[PDB]
C-alpha cells in the first residue's frame, strides 16, 4: 500500500498530511535521527540564580517544531545539568516538556512510527552554588549520503579513512605506511639494511594492492648517525627497488619519512 502526501486532493479529502508524516518528512530533509536536534537561539537565554530561561529558542526534535518563549527550567546546584526536550504524543494538550537532568538520557524513541516518550538533550548547563558558570549546547548531527559541494570552511577537523601497513621489505628494511583518504601515504623507514646492490630488487615482502601507487615513487631516506643518504623505488606492481649505495654485511640503521600520492 502506498500513502501519498505532497499531492493534490480533488475532493479536499484525498491526501491528508499528519504531524508524524510531516515530522518524518522534515527529518529526511535536514538529515537527522531521533538522537539529534535542530536548535537556534533567536535571543540569548537569560540565567537568573539556579534557573535558565529560554527567551526565544526554536527546537526541531524528531522532526517536530516547537518554540520556547520565556520558558524557565530549574537547575541543580554545583552540577552539570543536561537539559532535555521530552515529547509525549499521548499528552495531547501539551506534548513538549523540558527537564534538567543529571546525565545525557537521550533515548532515540521513534515517536513518528511507533509509541513511547522521546528524550533528547540540546543544552549542557554547568552551575555553581549561586548561579550558572558555563553553557555548552549539544552538537547538531547532519547524516548525509553524498555531497556535491563547490566550497567548504572547517573550524574544527575532518575525519578521513586511515589505513596502516607494516611491510618487511627485506635485507633488513621495515616500512611503516599510513594511508589517509585512500590517497596520501607517509612511509617511515625502520631497521638496519645489509647485503644489497644499486638497482637491485628487495628480498623480502612486497607492497600490498591498496597501498600500491599509480606510478613509481622515489622515496628518500637517511642512515642514522651518518651524513650519507638513500632512496627506494616503490613500483606500481608492489616491488621495492633499492637505489642507494651498495651495502656490505654490516647493517646500518635506516630512518626517515617519505610522502606520496596513490591516485
Amino acid at each position: 500500500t502506498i500513502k501519498n502526501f505532497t499531492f493534490f486532493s480533488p475532493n479536499s479529502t484525498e491526501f491528508p498530511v499528519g504531524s508524524n508524516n510531516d515530522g518524518k518528512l522534515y527529518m529526511m530533509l535536514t538529515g537527522m535521527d531521533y538522537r539529534t536536534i535542530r536548535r537556534k537561539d533567536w535571543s540569548s537565554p537569560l540565567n537568573t540564580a539556579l534557573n535558565v530561561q529560554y527567551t526565544n529558542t526554536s527546537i526541531i526534535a524528531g522532526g517536530r517544531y516547537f518554540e520556547l518563549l520565556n520558558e524557565t527550567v530549574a537547575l541543580k546546584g554545583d552540577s552539570v545539568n543536561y537539559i532535555h526536550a521530552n515529547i509525549d504524543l499521548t499528552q495531547t494538550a501539551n506534548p513538549v516538556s523540558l527537564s534538567a537532568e543529571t546525565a545525557n538520557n537521550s533515548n532515540g524513541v521513534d515517536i513518528n512510527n511507533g509509541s513511547g516518550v522521546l528524550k533528547v538533550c540540546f543544552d549542557i548547563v554547568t552551575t555553581s552554588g549561586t548561579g550558572v558558570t558555563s553553557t555548552k549546547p549539544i552538537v547538531q548531527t547532519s547524516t548525509l549520503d553524498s555531497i556535491s559541494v563547490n566550497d567548504m570552511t572547517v573550524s574544527g577537523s575532518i575525519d578521513v579513512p586511515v589505513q596502516t601497513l607494516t611491510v618487511e621489505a627485506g635485507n633488513g628494511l621495515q616500512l611503516q605506511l599510513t594511508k589517509k583518504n585512500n590517497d596520501l601515504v607517509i612511509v617511515r623507514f625502520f631497521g638496519s639494511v645489509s647485503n644489497i646492490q644499486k638497482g637491485w630488487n628487495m628480498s623480502g615482502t612486497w607492497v600490498d594492492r591498496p597501498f600500491r601507487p599509480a606510478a613509481v615513487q622515489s622515496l628518500v631516506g637517511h642512515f642514522a648517525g651518518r651524513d650519507t643518504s638513500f632512496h627506494i623505488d616503490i613500483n606500481p606492481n608492489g616491488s621495492i627497488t633499492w637505489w642507494g649505495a651498495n651495502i656490505d654485511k654490516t647493517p646500518i640503521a635506516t630512518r626517515g619519512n617519505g610522502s606520496y600520492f596513490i591516485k
Binding site: F8, P16, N86
Partner: protein, 149 residues
C-alpha cells in the same frame, strides 16, 4: 482529529491544490498516520501495590511491564525471559504475598528466578505512564492508600 477545508494541511480545491496561511485558523495537522499505535496507561496518583494479568507475545524475548516518570525516564520494571510463550503471567506486587507466576494451560510456574532483578528497582509507582514489553494484552488492578476516610 477531523479533516476541515482551509483548517487542515491538505492540497485541495483548484488544481494543483492549495493551503493558506491565515492568522489563528491557518493550518492545523488533522492527526497522525496509524494513530492506533499510541496508547497510554496513565498513572495520576502514587500507587503502592498491584495485581496485573499479563499476556505475552513472543517467547525468549523479555516480557513484562516498565514504568516511566513525568520526564520519560524508567525508574522500575518487572520483566521476564521465559523459554516458551506463557498463556499469561499473573503478578502480584503486594508485599505480604508477593506472586510472580506464569501460566501455561493448567500448569503454574514460578517466574521469580527468570525475572530481571536490575530493572526492578522499586515497588512504589510514581506519577507518569506504564509501557507493555512484549505483551499482546494486559489487565491491571491498582490499590492506592488513603490515611483517613
Amino acid at each position: 482529529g477531523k479533516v476541515i477545508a482551509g483548517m487542515s494541511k491538505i492540497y485541495g480545491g483548484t488544481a494543483p491544490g492549495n493551503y493558506k496561511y491565515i492568522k489563528g485558523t491557518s493550518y492545523t495537522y488533522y492527526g497522525e498516520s496509524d494513530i492506533d499505535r499510541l496508547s497510554r496507561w496513565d498513572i495520576k496518583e502514587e500507587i503502592f501495590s498491584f495485581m496485573g494479568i499479563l499476556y505475552p507475545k513472543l517467547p525468549k524475548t523479555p516480557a513484562g511491564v516498565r514504568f516511566l516518570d513525568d520526564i520519560g525516564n524508567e525508574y522500575t520494571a518487572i520483566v521476564f525471559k521465559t523459554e516458551q510463550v506463557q498463556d499469561y503471567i499473573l503478578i502480584n506486587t503486594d508485599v505480604n504475598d508477593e506472586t510472580y507466576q506464569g501460566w501455561k494451560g493448567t500448569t503454574a510456574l514460578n517466574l521469580f528466578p527468570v525475572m530481571d532483578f536490575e530493572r526492578y528497582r522499586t515497588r512504589i509507582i510514581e506519577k507518569g505512564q506504564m509501557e507493555l514489553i512484549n505483551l499482546s494484552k494486559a489487565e491491571f488492578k491498582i490499590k492506592r492508600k488513603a490515611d483517613f476516610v
